[PDB]
Design a protein around this ligand. Structure first.
Ligand code: 9FE
Ligand code: 9FE
Ligand code: 9FE
Ligand code: 9FE
Ligand code: 9FE
Ligand code: 9FE
Ligand code: 9FE
Ligand code: 9FE
Ligand code: 9FE
Ligand code: 9FE
Ligand code: 9FE
Ligand code: 9FE
Lengths: 157, 157, 154, 154, 157, 157
């Protein structure tokens, strides 16, 4: 009955994201990971690749599923009969930006947002920084699931 | 059965707290509001007065109940068969202090913490500031539940 | 003979901006809103019009376009104060650098005012983005502006 | 007929405070410094004296003690603006809450001004602490104040 | 020739502090840990106990020594022919407070301060929070050196 | 032999940068200023011009040398037999972004980062803001070394 949407680009999914997924799935009856796409800017990975990487690393979470979308997140949420967004926060700076979006989403659609604090070990990891470091040859193998690291290296080469 | 504990001194409960209670009660199967008893800091209202003010303001939340609590929060949470805390966040520094405590609570007991963003309207209200303003004759009636405001007038004369 | 300049791109002006204008206009004899010419949704002329329409009840405020150094705009009009709204500590830190630079190069001071709680989450950019994908932002914009924005999207 | 109140404990006034006073006095017709009576080093009378000595070149500023709600102090003097200096984003977030409460209960506005870079690290409390253990704070305080502080310590 | 002072109350020293010590000792010829005492407020541990706990957990750092002091830190630094302070920072909030003190110290004595970012695993640990959690029975064994944990439990009992 | 790398685009070097250089050169046996070459973002001065401006401003720092660099910073650091980075910090958000990168750099290569707090006088200056102000006729002469200001005038006509 209870449920939440976990949104992001997940380009690619990181161990920080996976931590958030696991914590949401432990506390909500169903969790939907929403891979949100900008049809006007390609990321590193295609939608199909992003979904595949997420599924391969969440096979142990039976109440989680993965879907893509675009446009307003609150539309994606409400069309599935849900009313909650769950997101990870790493810093007070993340909080101020996400706070704005959360209040806008509540204002326009009545959708609530719940934040969860990053695990300390992943506080510095982001998809963007992992891609940048890997582009220049840095070792990011401990920051990404097995479903991701070698696919990332493949894209870079 | 999903559930969470909402901890605080609630001295007195404000419309900001009530907003958090309502949002948590909408998303979890059960919410326990834990009114913290602190032997040292004896505030304005007794624990029983605080509990009754919360019950009055949450009469329409059937899956929310109110209890007093003492000592380590994660023990309170765990002894009730729960594994989640829910709290409101108003600002960046709110997040900084709470992040530390959420990480500590997850480390020592495996209890997770979910934060909800304040409604814009109540971003500036706190129990302490409302009491301080009220003490010197300021009008805080738009910031507190109806019942609370009447009881507050009483303790001031 | 007090006075202050309220600068921004205002693309478009929001109720958050209007709140700052009203508050500045209540505390200074003269307020100039400076619409900065610098990719936008509205033209400078349209922005000025929208602000002018929304500030009709403010007798001591006028609206003008501007280019170049803000402190030159301010001092060429005989003033030496800037008034700006602030939402967050992050807002403050960015604006702090600008304010100190502006004081250093030209002796122009900057006064910040805290956002009204109700508009803490509103920004021109977020309002445009939401409206673009169909969300209702009418409670966040002047009535004038809102209709004008619908026109630009359709 | 513009005006603003500059509140604080000023125990003692620093050059950081004085900078805020000078800047407020340059942009408002009337400035009242409100010395708040609330454990201090100086008495309210001594604080007022120190501020009065340091603000001699500011004709449109006066100094007064105050108790109770700041917004009552402000409105009883016919004004509805507070001016305060800010050093940090953390300063801003604390003051933001107060400013919004004050606007809510009494319609009093608050204008913040960014610290001069040179005094970003100075506070009454840190100056007193350093002076107590023998450090030289003379570059951070009005000449008057500095001598008065030496007296309190010896 | 190069050297730095690492100051604090260390009441008690934590694994976060020890991380800072090790990183300073790797980069400076000598490191002095300054246990700074307030003669007007006793902490949990006496000066002798604090020093002993630090020495027992830094025996593998041959260029580090531990001394106590009081009064102005810049005096402690300069009396040893040094001109540098090294401190750990966990958050932007730590930074703003420490920035003030660093600029004051540079102003009054010409002493420089170097900050180092906390290890991610210890970002939430502080002496004060560890003492508070332990006081109410929470498990802080993974946050403190072996030289500290059981002595802490002993003080509490 | 202690040492550190001070990285940046330095386009142009400011008095703020020079303050960091001087403080690092006072505390480390060797400082290497690394002028980052970025193929995409071609700024105002060529790399050789940037290197010469830094050498002119650091003529009295015998243990500081200036080099150009490309690619992963921790590779630059390690190939010079060093294991430390030194950078200035002006504000809280400076710290937030830099903290992430320092933790990443320590994770991927074991390279540490030391931050120095800005001198109050230069808290507001940056290469980008100085260039922007200069372009429109503002006087930035008090914010840049003497030599830099003359060269800046040249590139503007
Ligand atoms: O993948 C993203 O774009 C993204 C960004 C920011 C995020 N915060 N929390 C989560 Br889960 C998350 C995901
Ligand atoms: O991977 C990212 O892009 C990203 C960014 C920002 C984020 N905040 N919290 C989390 Br989990 C997170 C992840
Ligand atoms: O009442 C309190 O002490 C208190 C404090 C902090 C809080 N955060 N979120 C909530 Br609900 C809350 C309540
Ligand atoms: O009442 C307070 O002191 C208090 C503090 C901190 C808080 N965060 N979120 C909420 Br609702 C809240 C309330
Ligand atoms: O419209 C803008 O570009 C803009 C930006 C930033 C701003 N801060 N305060 C105000 Br009023 C303001 C306006
Ligand atoms: O509209 C914007 O882009 C914008 C940004 C930042 C802002 N701070 N305060 C205000 Br009012 C404001 C407005
Ligand atoms: O002296 C004080 O108590 C005090 C505190 C905080 C302050 N912010 N801005 C100013 Br001026 C100021 C003064
Ligand atoms: O002196 C103080 O205690 C104090 C504190 C905080 C402050 N912010 N801005 C100023 Br000026 C200021 C002064
Ligand atoms: O023990 C303390 O008081 C203390 C405080 C704050 C600190 N930051 N970095 C270090 Br090492 C440190 C030590
Ligand atoms: O243990 C503490 O008291 C404490 C406080 C604040 C701190 N910042 N960085 C470090 Br390491 C640190 C340690
Ligand atoms: O020149 C830059 O790009 C740059 C940026 C950021 C920086 N932090 N500290 C230093 Br020195 C520094 C230099
Ligand atoms: O020049 C810049 O862009 C820049 C940025 C960030 C910086 N932090 N510390 C220093 Br010095 C510094 C300089």
């Amino acid at each position: 009955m209870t449920g939440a949407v976990c949104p992001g680009s997940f380009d690619p999914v990181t161990l920080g994201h996976l931590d958030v997924f696991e914590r949401a799935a432990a506390q909500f009856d169903e969790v939907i990971v929403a891979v949100l796409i900008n049809p006007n800017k390609a990321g590193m990975f295609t939608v199909d690749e992003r979904i595949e990487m997420i599924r391969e690393s969440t096979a142990d979470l039976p109440n989680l599923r993965v879907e893509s979308g675009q446009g307003l997140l609150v539309d994606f949420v409400r069309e599935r009969g849900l009313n909650a967004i769950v997101k990870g926060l790493r810093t007070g700076t993340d909080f101020e930006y996400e706070l704005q979006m959360a209040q806008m989403n509540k204002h326009i659609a009545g959708v609530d947002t719940f934040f969860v604090a990053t695990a300390p070990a992943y506080s510095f990891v982001s998809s963007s920084l992992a891609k940048e470091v890997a582009t220049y040859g840095g070792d990011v193998s401990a920051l990404l699931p097995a479903s991701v690291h070698q696919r990332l290296l493949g894209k870079l080469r």
